[PDB]
Amino acid sequence: SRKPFIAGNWKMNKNPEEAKAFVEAVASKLPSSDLVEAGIAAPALDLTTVLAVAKGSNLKVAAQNCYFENAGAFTGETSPQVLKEIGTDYVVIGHSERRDYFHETDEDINKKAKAIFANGMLPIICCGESLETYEAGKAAEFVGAQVSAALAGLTAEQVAASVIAYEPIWAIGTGKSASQDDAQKMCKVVRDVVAADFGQEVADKVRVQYGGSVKPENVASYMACPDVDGALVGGASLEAESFLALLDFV
Amino acid sequence: SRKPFIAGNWKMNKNPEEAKAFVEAVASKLPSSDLVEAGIAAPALDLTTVLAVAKGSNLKVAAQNCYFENAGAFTGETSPQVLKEIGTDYVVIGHSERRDYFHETDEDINKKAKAIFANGMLPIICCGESLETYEAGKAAEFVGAQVSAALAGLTAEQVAASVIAYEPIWAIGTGKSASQDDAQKMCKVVRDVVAADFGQEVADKVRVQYGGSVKPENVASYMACPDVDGALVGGASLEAESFLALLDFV
Numbered sequence: 001s002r003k004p005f006i007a008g009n010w011k012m013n014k015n016p017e018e019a020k021a022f023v024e025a026v027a028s029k030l031p032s033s034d035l036v037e038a039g040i041a042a043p044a045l046d047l048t049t050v051l052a053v054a055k056g057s058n059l060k061v062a063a064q065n066c067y068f069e070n071a072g073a074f075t076g077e078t079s080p081q082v083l084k085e086i087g088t089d090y091v092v093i094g095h096s097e098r099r100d101y102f103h104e105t106d107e108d109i110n111k112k113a114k115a116i117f118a119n120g121m122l123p124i125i126c127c128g129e130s131l132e133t134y135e136a137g138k139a140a141e142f143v144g145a146q147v148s149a150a151l152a153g154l155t156a157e158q159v160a161a162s163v164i165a166y167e168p169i170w171a172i173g174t175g176k177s178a179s180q181d182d183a184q185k186m187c188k189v190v191r192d193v194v195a196a197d198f199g200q201e202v203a204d205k206v207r208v209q210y211g212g213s214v215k216p217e218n219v220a221s222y223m224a225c226p227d228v229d230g231a232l233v234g235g236a237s238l239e240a241e242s243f244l245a246l247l248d249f250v
Numbered sequence: 251s252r253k254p255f256i257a258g259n260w261k262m263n264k265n266p267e268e269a270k271a272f273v274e275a276v277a278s279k280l281p282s283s284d285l286v287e288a289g290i291a292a293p294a295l296d297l298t299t300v301l302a303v304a305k306g307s308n309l310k311v312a313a314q315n316c317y318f319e320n321a322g323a324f325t326g327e328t329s330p331q332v333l334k335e336i337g338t339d340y341v342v343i344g345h346s347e348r349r350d351y352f353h354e355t356d357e358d359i360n361k362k363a364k365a366i367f368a369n370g371m372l373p374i375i376c377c378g379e380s381l382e383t384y385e386a387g388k389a390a391e392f393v394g395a396q397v398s399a400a401l402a403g404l405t406a407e408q409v410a411a412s413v414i415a416y417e418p419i420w421a422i423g424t425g426k427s428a429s430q431d432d433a434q435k436m437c438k439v440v441r442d443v444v445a446a447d448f449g450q451e452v453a454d455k456v457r458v459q460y461g462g463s464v465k466p467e468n469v470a471s472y473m474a475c476p477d478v479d480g481a482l483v484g485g486a487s488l489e490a491e492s493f494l495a496l497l498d499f500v
């Protein structure tokens with residue numbers, strides 16, 4: 001019985017005042033912690049603000065990226081050590097946008113996952129295949145390799161506590177649309193990979209989120225699929241009213 | 251009559267409480283703004299804390315990097331619009347470490363400079379040649395090209411208000427050392443390219459910092475160089491006592 005987890009990725013949106021207003025509007029109105037886990041991945045500029053207002057609530061707080069060293073000569077980078085000290089719960093890593101624009105590799109993601117656990121936090125590891133890979137019938141192999149690479153070297157206990165988010169990158173365009181069948185098939189691809197590398201017992205504990213489009217009238221249907229344990233939500237997490245609406249399924 | 255500018259680049263160091271304690275120890279002890287401009291480039295996690303503690307002082311506040319769009323689907327990026335909204339003065343762009351680890355290009359830097367001005371802040375534009383380029387005898391040409399690429403499209407008034415930091419990359423972690431002679435030579439190369447592109451009047455206003463090994467014991471000797479207007483200082487800016495000691499040359 002894996003606990004569902006809806007994480008809202010604000011991406012590069014909101015200043016601290018806007019972030020503050022959002023958390024004040026949502027933190028005290030989330031469903032009970034036993035029913036669903038709810039969190040926000042906020043910009044680094046906004047984190048201390050989000051954490052202060054989220055204090056005493058069930059809203060989990062995630063960073064959108066971090067570097068793989070605790071400190072040093074890495075101008076412009078966010079430390080996982082500092083993230084932990086300020087009270088951050090999760091760190092999103094390997095998001096499609098970072099693997100794209102910012103050249104992040106499987107090796108960087110693996111290093112980040114290790115750094116995040118070394119700093120007592122939990123990673124939300126993103127994966128997903130391109131349109132080209134999808135059209136070539138290679139989604140399962142590509143995603144499988146990504147997942148395996150990211151987890152290599154973690155302990156069984158660390159794997160069991162990780163979150164993995166599957167993004168259907170191929171469905172961003174015009175002529176492609178993802179369905180519940182896609183979410184289920186791809187979330188199972190992730191879990192089977194974890195099973196092959198760490199065993200079925202570990203695989204059955206790791207949460208796998210769907211990162212494709214979910215809406216209030218469909219979120220429940222997607223989450224009810226056997227291998228889908230939550231959602232990494234983009235645009236719909238930017239408004240309090242919209243984010244809260246995605247927690248209705250519980 | 252170019253006002254000297256010492257900027258302490260903390261790089262990926264300090265949590266918010268550490269950042270607050272530092273500002274508390276240096277804000278009220280800085281020299282008059284008429285003598286020297288003093289700033290701190292702090293991690294994004296610490297910026298709101300630095301800004302609030304520095305409020306009312308003459309301590310300038312800088313970000314260590316930002317993206318070139320105000321908002322959007324850029325997971326993990328720091329917005330220049332939010333940097334302005336919180337009150338940031340400067341943004342360091344093109345630092346050697348980012349051009350290295352994150353493959354940042356001259357095109358990225360040019361877009362960032364424009365974004366920074368569009369948002370009402372000032373850039374600290376970093377440049378500098380590799381050991382290979384240095385050994386090839388092509389330092390002047392290489393650095394000149396970086397400066398020209400970074401400033402292309404900016405107005406003469408924007409260039410006059412910009413800050414450019416020459417980093418002797420060939421003498422950072424290579425077993426080679428750079429001296430006051432290299433600082434003067436290379437800071438003049440920078441100013442000469444500004445003069446060529448925007449006229450000598452503009453060039454005589456742009457502040458060119460040195461980004462090599464500067465310390466309290468030797469800062470005065472570098473500042474005496476006619477074309478050196480400051481320093482973008484790393485390790486020596488982490489301790490309060492040491493940062494203040496970089497400001498006593500006037």
Ligand code: NA
Nearest residue numbers: 223224225228
């Ligand atoms: Na499910």
Ligand code: NA
Nearest residue numbers: 336337338339
């Ligand atoms: Na300000």
Ligand code: NA
Nearest residue numbers: 350422423424
């Ligand atoms: Na190096």
Ligand code: NA
Nearest residue numbers: 421422426427
């Ligand atoms: Na050196």
Ligand code: NA
Nearest residue numbers: 473474475478
């Ligand atoms: Na000088």
